[PDB]
Amino acid sequence: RPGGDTIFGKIIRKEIPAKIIFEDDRCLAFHDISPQAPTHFLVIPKKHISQISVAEDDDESLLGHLMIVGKKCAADLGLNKGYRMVVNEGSDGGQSVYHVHLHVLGGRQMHWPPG
Amino acid sequence: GDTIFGKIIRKEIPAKIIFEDDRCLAFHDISPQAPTHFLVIPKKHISQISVAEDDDESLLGHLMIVGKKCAADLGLNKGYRMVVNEGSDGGQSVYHVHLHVLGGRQMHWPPG
Ligand SMILES: Nc1nc(=O)c2ncn([C@@H]3O[C@H](CSP(=O)(O)O)[C@@H](O)[C@H]3O)c2[nH]1
Numbered sequence: 001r002p003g004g005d006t007i008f009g010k011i012i013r014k015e016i017p018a019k020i021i022f023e024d025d026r027c028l029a030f031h032d033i034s035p036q037a038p039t040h041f042l043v044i045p046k047k048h049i050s051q052i053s054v055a056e057d058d059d060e061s062l063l064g065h066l067m068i069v070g071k072k073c074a075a076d077l078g079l080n081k082g083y084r085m086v087v088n089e090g091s092d093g094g095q096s097v098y099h100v101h102l103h104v105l106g107g108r109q110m111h112w113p114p115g
Numbered sequence: 116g117d118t119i120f121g122k123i124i125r126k127e128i129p130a131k132i133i134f135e136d137d138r139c140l141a142f143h144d145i146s147p148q149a150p151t152h153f154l155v156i157p158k159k160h161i162s163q164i165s166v167a168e169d170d171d172e173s174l175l176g177h178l179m180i181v182g183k184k185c186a187a188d189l190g191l192n193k194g195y196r197m198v199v200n201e202g203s204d205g206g207q208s209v210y211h212v213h214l215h216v217l218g219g220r221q222m223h224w225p226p227g
Pocket residue numbers: 007018019030031032033034035088093094095096097098101
């Protein structure tokens with residue numbers, strides 16, 4: 001079972017349903033089940049990386065691809081006033097699923113500080 | 116249009132620089148929102164993530180790898196939050212792409 005057995009690994013393998021926005025050979029974008037903004041989705045690699053703190057130097061293009069896919073999906077979803085991208089690392093970051101993921105939130109004014 | 120981050124890259128105004136290479140610069144935010152709050156910015160003037168090109172993919176990932184390495188060097192062993200703001204709803208404060216890295220305290224949900 002490639003991608004691991006976190007919830008996100010199971011979503012990658014179509015074993016648990018998700019509302020998918022975009023999929024390619026590197027990543028998957030799908031809506032967050034507990035949205036914190038009118039639009040709130042996740043972009044995740046298909047390769048399993050537990051957290052950003054352990055990503056390898058060779059993961060650079062993949063991590064950048066998450067952001068490129070994130071911004072393309074945001075435009076496809078009509079987030080013309082903007083959005084916020086978030087990666088949570090570890091306990092202080094609030095991380096609750098140990099498979100790297102980028103949040104994209106929009107459709108309302110986001111506030112500062114970002115949590 | 117040039118921005119204050121362009122001036123910082125060109126060393127025309129001071130900033131507390133954490134790391135630099137040939138393609139990016141990391142420095143502490145002048146208005147910190149956490150005990151550790153720094154930025155990683157590309158030297159290439161990409162005004163906002165929404166206009167980043169496909170060929171910029173590796174560079175954007177480089178900002179995150181540099182960010183996570185700087186976070187480790189700054190002692191953020193309990194974690195941190197990375198943020199990119201786009202546009203008015205995103206609260207983007209400077210129209211030069213920048214990755215925020217925040218830690219040294221519990222970050223909360225929602226993230227703004
Ligand atoms: N679509 C979806 N299906 C799930 O079965 C699930 N399970 C968690 N999630 C979201 O992933 C983030 C983890 S918290 P983090 O590690 O990003 O801090 C939170 O926004 C959840 O609502 C999920 N989303």
